[PDB]
Amino acid sequence: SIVVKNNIHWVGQRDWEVRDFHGTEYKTLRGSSYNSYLIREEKNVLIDTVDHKFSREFVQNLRNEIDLADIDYIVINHAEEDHAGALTELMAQIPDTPIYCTANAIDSINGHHHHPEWNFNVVKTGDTLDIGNGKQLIFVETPMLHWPDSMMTYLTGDAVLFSNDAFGQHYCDEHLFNDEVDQTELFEQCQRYYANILTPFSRLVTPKITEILGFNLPVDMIATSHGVVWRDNPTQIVELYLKWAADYQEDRITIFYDTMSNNTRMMADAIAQGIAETDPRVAVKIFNVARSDKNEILTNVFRSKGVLVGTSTMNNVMMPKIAGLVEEMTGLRFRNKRASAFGSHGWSGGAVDRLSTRLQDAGFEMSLSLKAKWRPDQDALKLCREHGREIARQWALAP
Amino acid sequence: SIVVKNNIHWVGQRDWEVRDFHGTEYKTLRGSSYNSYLIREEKNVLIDTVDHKFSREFVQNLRNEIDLADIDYIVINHAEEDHAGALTELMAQIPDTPIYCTANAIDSINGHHHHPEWNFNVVKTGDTLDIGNGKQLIFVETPMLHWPDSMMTYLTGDAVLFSNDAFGQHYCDEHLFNDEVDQTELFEQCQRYYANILTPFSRLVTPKITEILGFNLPVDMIATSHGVVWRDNPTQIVELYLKWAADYQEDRITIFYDTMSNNTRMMADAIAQGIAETDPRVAVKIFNVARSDKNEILTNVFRSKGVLVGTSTMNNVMMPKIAGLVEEMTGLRFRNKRASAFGSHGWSGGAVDRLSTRLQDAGFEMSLSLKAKWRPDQDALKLCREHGREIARQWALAP
Amino acid sequence: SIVVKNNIHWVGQRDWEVRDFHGTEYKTLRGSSYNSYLIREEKNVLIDTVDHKFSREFVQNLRNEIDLADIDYIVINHAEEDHAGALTELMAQIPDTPIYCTANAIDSINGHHHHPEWNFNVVKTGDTLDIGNGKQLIFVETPMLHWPDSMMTYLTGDAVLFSNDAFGQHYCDEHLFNDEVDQTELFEQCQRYYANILTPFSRLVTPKITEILGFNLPVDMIATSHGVVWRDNPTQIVELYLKWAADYQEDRITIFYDTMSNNTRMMADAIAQGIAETDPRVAVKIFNVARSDKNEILTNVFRSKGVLVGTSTMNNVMMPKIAGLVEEMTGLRFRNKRASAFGSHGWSGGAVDRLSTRLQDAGFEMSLSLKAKWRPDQDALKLCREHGREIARQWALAP
Amino acid sequence: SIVVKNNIHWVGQRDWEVRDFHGTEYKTLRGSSYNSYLIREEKNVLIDTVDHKFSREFVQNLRNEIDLADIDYIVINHAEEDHAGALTELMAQIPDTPIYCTANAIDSINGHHHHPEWNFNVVKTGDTLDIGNGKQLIFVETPMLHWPDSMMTYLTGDAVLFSNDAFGQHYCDEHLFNDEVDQTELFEQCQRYYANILTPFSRLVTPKITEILGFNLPVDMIATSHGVVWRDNPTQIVELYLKWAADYQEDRITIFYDTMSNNTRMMADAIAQGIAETDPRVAVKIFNVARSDKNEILTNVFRSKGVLVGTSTMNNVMMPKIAGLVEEMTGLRFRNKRASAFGSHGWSGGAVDRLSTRLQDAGFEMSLSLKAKWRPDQDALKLCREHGREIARQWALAP
Numbered sequence A, B, C, D: 001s002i003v004v005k006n007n008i009h010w011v012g013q014r015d016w017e018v019r020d021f022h023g024t025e026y027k028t029l030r031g032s033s034y035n036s037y038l039i040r041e042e043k044n045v046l047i048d049t050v051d052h053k054f055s056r057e058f059v060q061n062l063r064n065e066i067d068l069a070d071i072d073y074i075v076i077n078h079a080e081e082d083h084a085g086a087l088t089e090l091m092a093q094i095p096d097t098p099i100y101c102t103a104n105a106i107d108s109i110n111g112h113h114h115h116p117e118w119n120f121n122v123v124k125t126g127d128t129l130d131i132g133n134g135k136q137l138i139f140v141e142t143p144m145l146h147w148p149d150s151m152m153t154y155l156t157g158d159a160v161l162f163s164n165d166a167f168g169q170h171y172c173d174e175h176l177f178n179d180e181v182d183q184t185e186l187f188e189q190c191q192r193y194y195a196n197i198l199t200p201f202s203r204l205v206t207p208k209i210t211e212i213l214g215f216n217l218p219v220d221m222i223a224t225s226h227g228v229v230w231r232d233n234p235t236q237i238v239e240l241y242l243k244w245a246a247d248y249q250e251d252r253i254t255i256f257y258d259t260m261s262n263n264t265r266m267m268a269d270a271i272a273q274g275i276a277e278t279d280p281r282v283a284v285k286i287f288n289v290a291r292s293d294k295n296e297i298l299t300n301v302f303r304s305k306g307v308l309v310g311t312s313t314m315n316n317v318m319m320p321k322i323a324g325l326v327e328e329m330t331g332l333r334f335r336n337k338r339a340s341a342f343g344s345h346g347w348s349g350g351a352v353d354r355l356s357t358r359l360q361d362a363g364f365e366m367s368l369s370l371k372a373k374w375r376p377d378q379d380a381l382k383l384c385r386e387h388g389r390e391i392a393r394q395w396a397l398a399p
Ligand SMILES: Cc1cc2nc3c(=O)[nH]c(=O)nc-3n(C[C@H](O)[C@H](O)[C@H](O)COP(=O)(O)O)c2cc1C
Pocket: A258, A259, A260, A261, A262, A263, A264, A265, A311, A312, A313, A314, A315, A316, A317, A344, A345, A346, A347, A348, A349, A350, A373, A374, A375, B022
């Protein structure tokens, strides 16, 4: 365990090895951590647990900190298995202990653990739980940030916001605090997290932060459920989220494609050359989706004013990894971004139009598509470079 | 080089290392080979080249066999880069050498190599090229088996059918002939090849084989462009293709899914238990698409009377790898097969219906979907097992 | 659960998804299963549990079969986590239940579970446990097949040998019995298992099987801890093990290497051509260790009369993946096999001699090494082919 | 092509897709590029070519820039295939063109291309080649930075140092200059490159840089063979190399291991906790070698004052991936670093001592090893944490 502040004790778990979250949909190249907190005032409160894979360790470690029967209340901000995953093993030892959570969390907790007999206590925004010594917890519902069950818990006096997933990041380090870790790595992990997980809930971010601030509660620390506790200039992460939620983009274009014989790759490289020659302000990145980290592609899309996506025609349809990434983007809801589809074909083609239609349906504002037959010769590569120049001109930011 | 028969010399390339074809769409776990043949009669004829990656070796090796200027004719059955990939380097040495190919192959050859000045000679089915000593080549067009440019070349007297991709397989071995290799491995590779590449052209297979047989030409050997030369009971591969083309299926069900927290996996396992208990005749296979070889999944689909496909709901859409595999299956055109969609959701769901509609559009005859919320408890697992029992009963073959 | 025979009930777990065992040292491309058996006579006996990852399911499923308090005895044949992994969760419900195991298993069980207070009962070979109705269990110690704690348990009357890891295989199927599954796949998985895991204990295999047979106990079934129950001609797997233990080899040579710029790959391919031309009886396989399944390489080594291993020189040492595989082979103890080291270098070299010395130390009988500088030209490739011809002649089996 | 300065034209190749160099020994997660330069004064000089995979493109692109017959001289700084890989295709068009290179480069060029008839001109340090308009090239031999053939070429007047591999990095971007790319990414790639490739030649770095500076030649730009041209404060990369060569280390400890059942992982995590609690100045990183990027582990080792390496005992030897990484480290020659070996065992063990001996032989100054049996309980984890505390105290930097 590690002291957070006063009588707040981090009793979580670092996970150096973990490389896959949500099946294989989110790759954690710097591992992760699962933060749980024990507050010891007149009442003893446990905030969240840890991933199910560490259930045994979590309960044994908690015993080393406190006799389990001395825990008064358990707060579950969110019932995804990376936070409530040790709850069944803990509850087996202290079956009657009250659990405080949102109404939706009863559904999600029962959904995973199947113990509807536990003593649940529904909390709504503004509800309070007194823990003594002039301190209390104030609950704030945050539905769809990022699950229906989600909430945050604020501790008065100590002025700590327990934000669960919000403001967190998958970044394993033995140091608990934000000022103690490498800043470049920290912020890279924060942005990858927002881009890949929170983008579709962006419309909910500014209203919820606005609501919380209107409570006029001081924030000395933000203790999230993943990665660092924000204790040096904690509002920095809040301000980033406000920037990130507003249909964020930089002067940046991302190009990604799949290819069977490199023809669409040659088109992509020519497009990039045309962009770079025409508007040097623009940062350009190119990825082969079959050979690159998918989450890195999506973080780039999030950061970009526009994208070009490429596929050849394969059995009259799109290449499968491109079809999958377009499905995924549809669910992520990127906004205010432009796109252009491109690709090669051997005879009747069709995949480029099929792709451009799905990109439009995903919310991208479409420019003209670029098509070529078989392998582009010198003449065709010139047309590909010009497509890049024309896309750069059309998408250029104001001087 | 290796003697095929009489004056036919294999001058190809074995590829022990290759693991990816068509980008990463076809995984060659036993490597591959690229067969090219040099026939030396009164005229010298080269049939096909090899993959572009071995262009230097191919030309140097061919020089070891024959002075390049002594080659009279070049036959290109098919211009995909794994067979015509060394053509530019060869043609640079002997620029005026005549090339015999289909009309469509002029387009595809020019498409890849950009030398429209080469001396192309269009051949149609039944056209002949005399090479002396009472032998000649007879060309047979085979459009869309598997490209518009595809054809086969038959050599009279020696009675050898050069079938290019047809009847071939990706299976690297130093032994050239079918009777010289491991039979289980050979036939596994043949079926994986047909299932993953030729399924969508199945309707063309029986008419083309019927046409070729109606020529009343003896076949002593079938010399393909990948893997073994069929010289012991060569019609065995032809008969397999006739079986494979007729909307082939065995008494077999394939279950595949993706999952973020294992809920859909639990459903899949319960379904399988219900099937196995109800109809023991049925071979059942289960795959997590995020953790398994995709081509092996598709070979199983090809072999199956039906499939169950599973996904959870992720950001109101399907899991991406499932969306991609459904796109791919749509292009493959499986026929006479049944399906049932299944999966878990947390709140409003939607992915199962989205999946079932796309499976129907891909040609599967749909049975009822199976849905569950969060993690299935004992009661829900019973419903999943019963879904399996009911699917087994509905899809059962006649006693 | 599934009936094995009479009152023996399979209460295990199928694992369709698992792809890695022992870290990543053993890849299970066809999944696996964990077999546990409940015998219900006058006494109720549980034989083994399942992998720790399925602990919750195992106990819940066992409850569906029997009230936990009705279990009289628990037999633990082997305490590796894939079999005793659910023991802590089970013992928490029935703390006083007697456990029967070898002396060494007390050490290994306490080693993993840390409950030395459990009621252990040491069994030695020939000890018996009466379970009523004229049936009893007879224990047979099998130390280092494959752990110090290992044993088998034989059930009289029903004539079932519970062999735990021995005779098992990682092969997931819903059908329990050997006659119900695909035979090619079954035997492939059995051999991969023996080659990769049991080879170093081969010297113990023939004496232990000899001892068991000398008991004159009928064997109607062999119920292992992984994969199928052998009930049709069960001695078939026993006879295979006797063949496999006797320093098994076929007329087969395996070539494997790593390479930075393909020079050692070119040497390997030339060597193979020389072998194939010289002794057509020999099955040859070639693997790039950086691009191939390591367990498949080792299964081939096991099946081979000899191996050639290749590395270039990298920073005055061997390429790392080759150093690792030689370490692993040293621990596996291959016997009666021949080897030859080969590779390329740029200047002073040294890796080939370094490799040949380690192969000798691993137990291989060494033939001359083959060395080349940079990329082999035509002359050097001739020398590589001749090395193959000479190796084939030297290692040839009798006519 | 892109203008570098005055009459110097970049005529290289960007490689967005490439992910593997030197087999799979160096992973390029941000791609790479191959820089070649054409200088057009009174004489026309080509400096280097590009990777063999882009040979066709390179020659076609060069034709677009200049008639091949107008090239006067070719300079080959280094004959590895990523730079001289297009030389055979270029030389086929202009066979008589003089090549300037080191004596050793004749051996390496002939080694790869097998055209000893080409007109080679040996250059030694200080030799000059006049190209007119008051400019000339001055050659500087740099043997073993990083091959025997390596050299740099300096262009007077324009004051550009063509350093080939030295000062380069694998970092693909359409922008050519150092001030035009993301600085964090650039410097990350520079350090990964030095750590993984140049560490063993560190002793040669300070003398060669000292020699070059003693020439009193102004340096306006450093045009390397990979990544950016250094044109803004170009000496920044030179100063980094001087820091990196001096047995570089930060206040940082790297822990890495392999594990079959997570016991050694538990030890590693406890060790890390002890370090972090004892000396908060120290940055700690932990990697499972079977699940992490190997080059990232080695970059961390390079940056570290010490390492702890972990393995269990497997068949009386070390786990193979650990044996391979120790072989690789032996060749890399890390200096002034401390180490401690650790790991778990089941019975007789031996792998930890085996590992500690090899680490000592690799140049690490050894502290005591840490050993545990099976899975560490609470008592054993305390000993592991204390090992961490004791290692932190011993290795602490001065206050
Ligand atoms: C397996 C396969 C299936 C194909 N199916 C089609 C098709 O249905 N329609 C078409 O016009 N071209 C088809 N082609 C041709 C490719 O689209 C053509 O080779 C294209 O130039 C490839 O571009 P790429 O190298 O970027 O993949 C197919 C090619 C392959 C290898």
